[PDB]
């Protein structure tokens, strides 16, 4: 790898605008995994066997 | 790796705007994992076997 | 690794604006993990087997 | 006139609800009479020759 | 006139609710009569020749 | 006129609620009569020739 004058953006999250007006919500969770908000995960590299990256709303009952 | 004049952004989260006006919410969680807010995870590298990176709303009952 | 004039940003979270006006909330958690606020995790490297990085709203009943 | 146990309502205006959300308006009046709001006139009696009662948006160039 | 146990309401204005949210307005009046707000006129009796009662947005160039 | 146990309301204005949120306004009046607010006029009797009662947004260039 060798960069020369490189305006690079690599593994990036941006400009995630989210408006909400007069919105009702209601959750009744029992042992599950409810996800309702904003999730902005930015990575570059994940190694490994059996790994898990960026696990939103994940239920693992192995 | 070798950089020369490199305006790099690597593994980054930004500009996550979030407005909310007159919004009701209500959660009744029992042993689960409810997630409702803003989550901005930025990493670059995660190694390892069986690891977990960026685990929002995760329930692990292995 | 070798940098020369490198305006680098690596493993960074910024500009996470969050407004909230006249918003009700109500949580009734029992042994779970409810997460409702802002979470800005920024790392660069995490090693290890079986590790966990950036675990929001996580329930581990292994 | 003679009342006995008389729940009378005579010459009355009520319960004039008026909502407005995200509404633009723009008037360019020149010598006229522009009327844009809420007008609730309640009278009982008006006598006289040539009189005028309850004159909204009225232009009189006699 | 003679009242006996008379819950009378005569010449009355009430319960004029008026909400407005995020509303622009703009007036450019020149010698006219622009009316934009709430007007609640309640009278009972007006006598006289040539009189005027309850004159909103009125232009009289006689 | 003779009252006996008479809960009378005569020539009355009440309960004029008026909310306004995030509302712009702009007036450029030149010799006219711009009216933008709340006006609650309550009278009972007005006599006389050529009189004027309850004159909102009135321009008289006779």
Curated annotation (Swiss-Prot), chains A, B, C, D, E, F:
Q: What is the effect of changing residue 14 to A?
A: Impairs copper-binding
Tissue distribution of the protein = Highly expressed in presynaptic terminals in the central nervous system. Expressed principally in brain.
Q: How is it modified after translation?
A: Phosphorylated, predominantly on serine residues. Phosphorylation by CK1 appears to occur on residues distinct from the residue phosphorylated by other kinases. Hallmark lesions of neurodegenerative synucleinopathies contain alpha-synuclein that is modified by nitration of tyrosine residues and possibly by dityrosine cross-linking to generated stable oligomers.
Region annotated 4 X 11 AA tandem repeats of [EGS]-K-T-K-[EQ]-[GQ]-V-X(4) sits at 1-31
Q: Where is it localised? A: Cytoplasm; Membrane; Nucleus; Synapse
Q: Name positions with the PTM Phosphoserine.
A: 51
Description of how the protein assembles with itself and partners: Soluble monomer. Homotetramer. A dynamic intracellular population of tetramers and monomers coexists normally and the tetramer plays an essential role in maintaining homeostasis. Interacts with UCHL1. Interacts with phospholipase D and histones. Interacts (via N-terminus) with synphilin-1/SNCAIP; this interaction promotes formation of SNCA inclusions in the cytoplasm. Interacts with CALM1. Interacts with STXBP1; this interaction controls SNCA self-replicating aggregation. Interacts with SNARE components VAMP2 and SNAP25; these interactions allows SNARE complex assembly and integrity.
Record note on domains? The 'non A-beta component of Alzheimer disease amyloid plaque' domain (NAC domain) is involved in fibrils formation. The middle hydrophobic region forms the core of the filaments. The C-terminus may regulate aggregation and determine the diameter of the filaments.
Q: Which disease is it linked to?
A: Genetic alterations of SNCA resulting in aberrant polymerization into fibrils, are associated with several neurodegenerative diseases (synucleinopathies). SNCA fibrillar aggregates represent the major non A-beta component of Alzheimer disease amyloid plaque, and a major component of Lewy body inclusions. They are also found within Lewy body (LB)-like intraneuronal inclusions, glial inclusions and axonal spheroids in neurodegeneration with brain iron accumulation type 1. Parkinson disease 1, autosomal dominant: A complex neurodegenerative disorder characterized by bradykinesia, resting tremor, muscular rigidity and postural instability. Additional features are characteristic postural abnormalities, dysautonomia, dystonic cramps, and dementia. The pathology of Parkinson disease involves the loss of dopaminergic neurons in the substantia nigra and the presence of Lewy bodies (intraneuronal accumulations of aggregated proteins), in surviving neurons in various areas of the brain.
The protein's job, in short, is: Neuronal protein that plays several roles in synaptic activity such as regulation of synaptic vesicle trafficking and subsequent neurotransmitter release. Participates as a monomer in synaptic vesicle exocytosis by enhancing vesicle priming, fusion and dilation of exocytotic fusion pores. Mechanistically, acts by increasing local Ca(2+) release from microdomains which is essential for the enhancement of ATP-induced exocytosis.
Family recorded in the similarity comment? Belongs to the synuclein family.
The name on file for this protein is Alpha-synuclein
Give the organism the record lists: Homo sapiens
Show which stretch of the intact protein is covered.
37 to 98 of 140
